[PDB]
Amino acid sequence: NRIITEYILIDANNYHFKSWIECFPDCKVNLKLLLFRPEWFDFFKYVESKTYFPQLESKLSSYLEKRQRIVPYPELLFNTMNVLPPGKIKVVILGQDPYPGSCISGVPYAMGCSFSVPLNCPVPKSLANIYTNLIKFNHMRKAPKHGCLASWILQGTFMINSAFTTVLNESGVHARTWESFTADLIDYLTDNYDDLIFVAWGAHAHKLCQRVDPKKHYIITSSHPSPYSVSNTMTSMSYGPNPKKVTYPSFNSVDHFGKINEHLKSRNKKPIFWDL
């Protein structure tokens, strides 16, 4: 019933998405119905055949039975995938958990994309720090007044949270729930596509990016842009035959988007315009 801008370019003052209990009045959670982009059906067909998948829909249904306010709303749950078919992904930026907060009016900040928030919401501090980094390395001259990343995602920036849901006003309460789904999503992308760019901000995203073959794909690692880590180095477990903690630079010292640009250009791929 909608076109893509209606899902990805969201206005908090004109927010008509149904909540979970409205889409599933009888708690009959059906994640497949939340995926509007046909190029993902093959991946989804692989995921429903796994034994964890009924467990996932069971846990979500149980949260609805207890009347928990799951965010983001289900028409936004798979937002980044509904914008981007897998064959059009150029950069994967992992978040951890969705924003738990909301506007005065009850519009959630979570919109099914990592780091992004609807128009006419406050810019979260992590995202402000990302903008600061873009300004510092000459990719942008002034911070946008909003926090809506529709522009980057439409151009192939696959910005998802490894935990696709949380509960309104509670941080990270569904961290185990999505781990197998997200692992299969990462594995699907790295098995079927080549020379993606993975951006690992923080130790959790870095663990996830060590599922990825670093000779087949390009992995960029630093600390997280949140104010608690933006200007400090990060220590993160480097897995393998001889596991050891390694130190990675602070977020605000790395030219993340310059590095994305140079890698895309070195493979003759179309660039991403960060400012527009």
Numbering used by the authors: 95 to 370
Publication excerpt:
In the BER pathway, uracil-DNA glycosylase (UDG) recognizes uracil which exists in DNA and creates an abasic site by cleaving the N-glycosidic bond between uracil and deoxyribose. Interestingly, APMV UNG (mvUNG) is longer than other known UNGs, suggesting that it contains domains or motifs in addition to the canonical catalytic domain. mvUNG (residues 1–370) contains a catalytic domain conserved among UNG family proteins. Additionally, it has an N-terminal domain (N-domain; residues 1–130) and an insertional motif (motif-I; residues 327–343).
